[PDB]
Design a binder for this molecule. Structure first.
Ligand SMILES: Nc1nc2c(ncn2[C@@H]2O[C@H](COP(=O)(O)OP(=O)(O)OP(=O)(O)O)[C@@H](O)[C@H]2O)c(=O)[nH]1
Ligand SMILES: Nc1ncnc2c1ncn2[C@@H]1O[C@H](COP(=O)(O)OP(=O)(O)CP(=O)(O)O)[C@@H](O)[C@H]1O
Ligand SMILES: Nc1nc2c(ncn2[C@@H]2O[C@H](COP(=O)(O)OP(=O)(O)O)[C@@H](O)[C@H]2O)c(=O)[nH]1
Ligand SMILES: Cc1cc(F)cc(S(N)(=O)=O)c1
Ligand SMILES: [Ca+2]
Ligand SMILES: [Ca+2]
Ligand SMILES: [Ca+2]
Ligand SMILES: [Mg+2]
Ligand SMILES: [Mg+2]
Ligand SMILES: [Mg+2]
Lengths: 437, 349, 425, 54
């Protein structure tokens, strides 16, 4: 059994981590006090849930998580919330004033003063790992901490944990649920300095989570709790292989091998279905083929884009609930004859399928309804490059006037890092275009 | 108060639509780089579709279907016809065609020669034509291939209709243009008014060197033709006259002899790619005006020539058609505070 | 614990600051003796931002009152909430400033500035994590203008990385005390351009025109003009004083509102502004339409003469946040020609569940608009009309200043106008 | 349409299907960058104090 250390950075990372570990507990039958009755080995064992949970002699199951924020307001809720007993205080790290939505601040000014402290706490969790696989890093693009401190953390992790993998769960900026104007800057700054340090990254566009909440869950104005409970459902489907028995995506190494044939192009598109509102007295339970076919509808993608006008490089189907191999392949045939699924000629036109019999778990009182079967498609489309184009364009409009640049230079960053970062995105877009068109 | 931006100053069509939109007093034009727009009259090449439908509170509409180039490109249309099972390789309304890359660059060179050698041996008319989106008519395959290699872009060789329907008096070739408009709901509307761009030169089958009586383009007739404007004004015969002719000469109607085949071809092409370019469940909506060009032989059979994704309109039909675009395409998604001039081609989505 | 240190200087500064603490004190449930008697924990969630907690659960505003004459501050101490202020935080003199910038910045004020900084330092040392400072003052007088800017220049020396915020009242010939107000304003404006991060420009003409025309006050008084500033101050600080999905500290606001260091002069706005037909329910559209109308803006500038660099709206009260978003995006989508297109989504909206005392809902407007250049244009013209003849200079030269220093201030602001002008095109 | 590498256990199963065949900086360099920006902050603040001293 190999362990995974999860790192939650900034407000977005910490709050999303709150919704994930809440879900990990309901799934694995872990109580708020850390107890797990079903676990028959007290204070140890190399089970599948031990990849994310350590065990004390007293029978407490402690997440392998680290929460970092440059301001203590958000992490302070965790210290007195429902799951205050799961974590011990070392796992929660908080500064005294944030990065003011300023990449340079979180990276250089404040980051330098706390980086060695985080690495120290991370080393403690690592010292409890007999074979650490890698790290799961949750953060936002627009946040000054999410973008600024994360990129510094990644650089260091690659130095102190060379042969280890690092996956990201990144929150892509959306105006509808943001008050910051400088998020394009922060996004392109952190993607530039984090690219060569991240083996695979799952972008979630808040614009997509927002409309899925208003459209499917009939939430007129969703809250972060609403957005986060949905985001963790997808995260649970992605990490389920690492926490349950299985053969597909059993360790973090298998995520690059199965989803990233080219290094720089390591941003899979996630598609999840079904998302049904709990207010519905009862809903027609969708079939394997119906939920599968939905995987190619833009309306359930984590990033609004058109896969029809891209080229796939890989494709994983993760199923949870009442599903058998016979049903999966049947729907696959029906969709290729109806849908436009053009692969790159140097990649096999095939799908890797994973099935877990335990149907999705729903938070009692949450917004999502119980379903008999659900699927999450991880596809590596050139179409996600659309998100880079939208973002790069917003970067160009501002940088052409140097608007807000003084705030960054004033924290010690050089203006040249801007153009050096933007030119890297220009190179990123060209790669996609070369692989797709 | 709706807002729109203009990104193609050369579009004669949408220049009128924009002129009309402003005439309503309810549409407002913005700078071509202002993202807060309800409607975009987008550029032709490299239109950034990926940036549409991401502005909170704005239902955005664009005048181009992403991916429709598969149908409006000479080489793409060929591949789409041969490979698509909806159209199949034996589609009966499209001339036998082949994709021929120049030797300085898959390719159907040998496939064409086999069919050519078969026609040369069977005493059948073996006159082909080569062309590209960026023209040579010849009966010897040697002259067709050597011409393509002299260029540096992809070309297409297809059978040349050697028995084209000739209008009288004159004995002259011609083509027919039909404008088709697809709205956001993917309804296929055919404009009731077509045009015949006629050749003012008598068709001659024993000399493909001079391309003035063979090519019925409005520019070549007005530049390389000596009888331009003799029989009809601007080498353009509209449906009223052409239909009266088909009745006095052939004792039939334009509806039965030609229009049924045109309407059937339009449906076949658009329905074929609907899954690939539909915006039914997309974050933005699309609509686009198309220009189909057909050929009519002496057996009153219609043949598809090419499809234009950015066509112009006959001078006498700019007002009627442009206004029509604003009714079923724009205001259908942005209403304002008949006897349709279109022919709805019902179909299964 | 993100504490703010408040400072109010001179007659205008202390009277306005006085009413400011009177308004928010009621909103947080603090009585005139510093005791809390509110009914919602939201009133105390961020109460330490502006208040210190003394023994016996007493809440003491974190405010330092400054003046060169005892007159105005004596009124505050005898005022309604005068008892609420810390006794030692009163720093004053006897010479006065005679509405003279030189006296407030070089001679009289310089003799007293060191003692005020001693109190500031005392309040800072008790701050767990000090956000920054906020100053209230007028620019056309002598103490708030001349010494106020002296304090800012010295505070930046001792706290170079804390945020400096000011509420600055700009003079107008229509509501004028002395003819030298343009002189003092031009000298202070240069100080603010250098040593503040955000300056809420409050024009006394706009305040006057609002009271007379919109509010239907036959004969306005400085007290009337201060009721507006009070409500406005309570609005712009709602983000700092109450909880919500907005968070927002001074440095975050500065970073998203100020795209360029010197263009940090904001136009504030408040809605509703109702004359006593006052019990009517105001709809979300009515709030929005009013909030953007010029008649509701306190800079005396016509925004339709410039372009918004950034815009921040704060809505207060139980309302349809969905309907708020709808109306806000409607204003942007029906007037996009006035928002610079090179700053995507430069219009942000926050919601707060607690409305001002006696209002079912309200909306505060904060705008970084290039139209503010018209304000500095008025000041520059009135300045040059007198300086070209050197009229009234002896008041200043008699305190040690030279004509050179005036010409520079003159050029410093004309440059400021030109900077606002290039970003409008 | 081929199914390969079927693995079955008590908690589920997984398999692969093929439709068609095909056709860093050291810790020294990081400390320098962090200090380089810290040096540009010190110099910038030095010029402000120099400005204020004047
Ligand atoms: N999905 C989701 N997005 C969030 C959440 N919290 C913040 N965001 C998004 O993150 C972006 C801002 O980043 P933050 O995480 O708040 O910034 P930060 O990491 O705290 O860094 P600071 O600037 O120091 O506060 C905005 O665009 C928000 O929409 C969350 O809980 N869930
Ligand atoms: N296979 C064929 N048989 C007979 N005539 C043909 C033909 N292919 C082309 N033509 C002639 O060529 C003309 C159309 O040329 P084509 O459309 O290929 O070039 P083009 O695209 O630059 C003109 P447009 O786009 O305006 O229709 C028609 O007038 C037709 O008479
Ligand atoms: N809004 C408002 N403005 C004032 C008030 N008192 C003075 N002013 C303005 O402030 C300027 C004079 O400054 P003042 O405060 O009297 O000078 P100081 O006390 O020496 O700093 C003039 O332009 C006045 O119009 C007031 O109570 N309210
Ligand atoms: C489901 C859940 C649990 C939790 F403890 C905190 C959240 S949050 N921070 O996103 O509001 C969400
Ligand atoms: Ca165990
Ligand atoms: Ca690495
Ligand atoms: Ca003295
Ligand atoms: Mg934060
Ligand atoms: Mg053409
Ligand atoms: Mg006075």
């Amino acid at each position: 059994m190999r362990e995974c250390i999860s790192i939650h950075v900034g407000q977005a990372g910490v709050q999303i981590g709150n919704a994930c570990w809440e879900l990990y507990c309901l799934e694995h039958g872990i109580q708020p006090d850390g107890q797990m009755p079903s676990d028959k080995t007290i204070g140890g064992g190399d089970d599948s849930f031990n990849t994310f949970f350590s065990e004390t002699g007293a029978g407490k199951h402690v997440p392998r998580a680290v929460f970092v924020d440059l301001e203590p307001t958000v992490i302070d809720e965790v210290r007195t919330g429902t799951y205050r007993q799961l974590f011990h205080p070392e796992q929660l790290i908080t500064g005294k004033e944030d990065a003011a939505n300023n990449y340079a601040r979180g990276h250089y000014t404040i980051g330098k003063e706390i980086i060695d402290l985080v690495l120290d706490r991370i080393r403690k969790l690592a010292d409890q790992c007999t074979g650490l696989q890698g790290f799961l890093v949750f953060h936002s693009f627009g946040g000054g901490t999410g973008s600024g401190f994360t990129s510094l953390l990644m650089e260091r992790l690659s130095v102190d944990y060379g042969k280890k993998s690092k996956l990201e769960f990144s929150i892509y900026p959306a105006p509808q649920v943001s008050t910051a104007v400088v998020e394009p800057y922060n996004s392109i700054l952190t993607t530039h300095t984090t690219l060569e340090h991240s083996d695979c990254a799952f972008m979630v566009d808040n614009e997509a989570i927002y409309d899925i909440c208003r459209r499917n869950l009939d939430i007129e104005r969703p809250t972060y709790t609403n957005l986060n409970r949905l985001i963790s459902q997808i995260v649970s489907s992605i990490t389920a292989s690492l926490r349950f028995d299985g053969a597909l995506n059993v360790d973090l190494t298998e995520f690059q091998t199965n989803l990233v044939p080219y290094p720089r192009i390591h941003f899979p598109l996630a598609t999840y279905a079904p998302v049904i509102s709990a207010e519905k007295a009862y809903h027609e339970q969708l079939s394997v083929a119906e939920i599968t076919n939905a995987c190619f509808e833009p309306a359930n993608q984590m990033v609004k884009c058109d896969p029809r006008h891209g080229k796939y490089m890989a494709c994983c189907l993760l199923y949870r609930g009442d599903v058998v191999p016979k049903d999966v392949n049947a729907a696959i045939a029906t969709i290729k004859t109806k849908r436009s699924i053009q692969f790159v000629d140097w990649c096999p036109t095939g799908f890797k399928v994973g099935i877990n019999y335990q149907p999705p778990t729903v938070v009692p009182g949450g917004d999502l309804a119980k379903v008999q079967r659900a699927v999450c498609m991880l596809s590596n489309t050139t179409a996600i490059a659309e998100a880079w184009a939208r973002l790069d364009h917003k970067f160009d409009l501002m940088y052409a006037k140097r608007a807000f640049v003084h705030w960054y230079v004033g924290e010690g960053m050089e203006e040249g890092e801007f153009s050096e970062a933007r030119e890297d995105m220009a190179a990123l877009e060209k790669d996609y275009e070369e692989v797709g068109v | 108060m709706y807002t729109f931006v203009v990104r193609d100053e050369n579009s004669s069509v949408y220049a009128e639509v924009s002129r009309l939109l402003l005439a309503t007093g309810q549409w407002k034009r913005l700078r071509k780089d202002n993202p807060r727009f309800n409607l975009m009259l987008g550029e032709r090449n490299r239109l950034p579709f990926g940036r549409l439908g991401h502005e909170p509170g704005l239902v955005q509409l664009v005048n181009y279907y992403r991916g429709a180039d598969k149908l409006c490109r000479k080489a793409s249309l060929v591949k789409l016809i041969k490979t698509s099972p909806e159209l199949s390789e034996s589609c009966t309304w499209f001339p036998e065609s082949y994709v021929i890359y120049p030797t300085n660059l898959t390719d159907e060179r040998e496939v064409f020669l086999a069919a050519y050698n078969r026609r040369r041996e069977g005493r059948e008319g073996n006159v082909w034509i080569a062309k590209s989106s960026a023209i040579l008519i010849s009966s010897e395959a040697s002259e067709l291939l050597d011409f393509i290699d002299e260029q540096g872009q992809v070309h297409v060789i297809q059978k040349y209709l050697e028995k084209p329907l000739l209008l009288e008096p004159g004995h002259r070739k011609f083509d027919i243009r039909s404008w088709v408009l697809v709205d956001h709901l993917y309804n296929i509307y055919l404009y009731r008014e077509g045009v015949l761009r006629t050749s003012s030169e008598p068709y001659n089958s024993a000399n493909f060197q001079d391309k003035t009586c063979h090519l019925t383009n409005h520019c070549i007739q007005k530049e390389y033709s000596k009888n331009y404007g003799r029989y009809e004004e601007g080498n353009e015969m509209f449906f009223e006259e052409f239909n009266q002719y088909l009745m006095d000469a052939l004792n039939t109607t334009l509806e039965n002899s030609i229009l049924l085949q045109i309407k059937h071809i339009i449906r076949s092409c658009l329905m074929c790619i609907e899954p690939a370019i539909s915006t039914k469940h997309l974050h933005y909506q699309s609509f686009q005006l198309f220009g189909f060009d057909f050929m009519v032989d002496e057996e009153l059979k219609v043949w598809l020539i090419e499809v234009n994704g950015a066509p112009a309109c006959a001078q006498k039909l700019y007002a009627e058609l442009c206004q029509g675009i604003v009714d079923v395409a724009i205001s259908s998604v942005f209403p304002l505070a008949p006897t349709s001039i279109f022919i709805k081609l019902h179909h299964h989505h | 614990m993100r504490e703010i240190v408040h400072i109010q200087a001179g007659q205008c500064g202390n009277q306005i600051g006085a009413k400011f603490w009177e308004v928010i004190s009621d909103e947080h449930g603090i009585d005139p003796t510093g005791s809390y008697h509110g009914d919602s924990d939201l009133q105390l969630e961020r109460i330490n931002v502006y208040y210190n907690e003394a023994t016996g659960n007493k809440y003491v505003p974190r405010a330092i009152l400054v003046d060169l004459e005892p007159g105005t501050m004596d009124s505050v101490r005898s005022g309604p909430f005068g008892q609420i202020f810390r006794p030692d935080n009163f720093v004053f003199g006897q010479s006065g400033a005679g509405n003279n910038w030189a006296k407030g910045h070089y001679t009289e004020g310089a003799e007293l500035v060191d003692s005020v900084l001693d109190v500031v330092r005392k309040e800072s040392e008790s701050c767990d994590c000090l956000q920054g400072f906020q100053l209230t003052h007028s620019l056309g007088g002598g103490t708030g203008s001349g010494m106020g800017t002296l304090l800012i220049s010295k505070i930046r020396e001792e706290y170079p990385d804390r945020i400096m915020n000011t509420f600055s009242v700009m003079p107008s010939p229509k509501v004028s005390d002395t003819v030298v107000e343009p002189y003092n304003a031009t000298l202070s404006v240069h100080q603010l351009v250098e040593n503040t991060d955000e300056t809420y420009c409050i024009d006394n003409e706009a305040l006057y025109d609002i009271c007379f025309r919109t509010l239907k006050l036959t004969t306005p008084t400085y007290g009337d003009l201060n009721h507006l500033v009070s409500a406005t101050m309570s609005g712009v600080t709602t983000c700092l004083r109450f909880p919500g999905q907005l968070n927002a500290d001074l440095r975050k606001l500065a970073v998203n509102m100020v795209p360029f260091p010197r263009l940090h002069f904001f136009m504030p706005g408040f809605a509703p502004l109702t004359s006593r037909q006052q019990y009517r329910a105001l709809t979300v559209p009515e709030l929005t339409q009013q909030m953007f109308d010029s008649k509701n803006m306190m800079a005396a500038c016509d925004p339709r003469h410039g372009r918004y660099l950034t815009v921040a709206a704060i809505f207060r009260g139980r309302m349809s946040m969905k309907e708020v978003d709808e109306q806000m995006l409607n204003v942007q989508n029906k007037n996009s020609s006035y928002f610079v297109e090179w700053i995507p989504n430069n219009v942000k909206t926050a919601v707060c569940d607690i409305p001002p005392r006696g209002l079912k809902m309200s909306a505060t407007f904060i705008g970084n608009s290039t139209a503010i250049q018209e304000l500095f244009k008025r000041i520059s013209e009135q300045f040059t009309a007198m300086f070209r003849r050197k009229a009234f200079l002896h008041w200043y030269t008699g305190e040690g200043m030279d004509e050179m220093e005036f010409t520079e201030a003159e050029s410093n602001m004309n440059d400021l106008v030109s900077e606002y002008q290039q970003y409008q095109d | 349409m081929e199914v390969i590498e079927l693995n079955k256990c008590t908690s589920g199963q997984s398999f692969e299907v093929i439709l068609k065949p095909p056709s860093d900086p050291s810790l020294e360099e990081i400390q320098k960058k962090l200090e380089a920006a810290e040096e540009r902050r010190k110099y910038q603040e030095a010029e402000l104090l120099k400005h204020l001293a004047e």
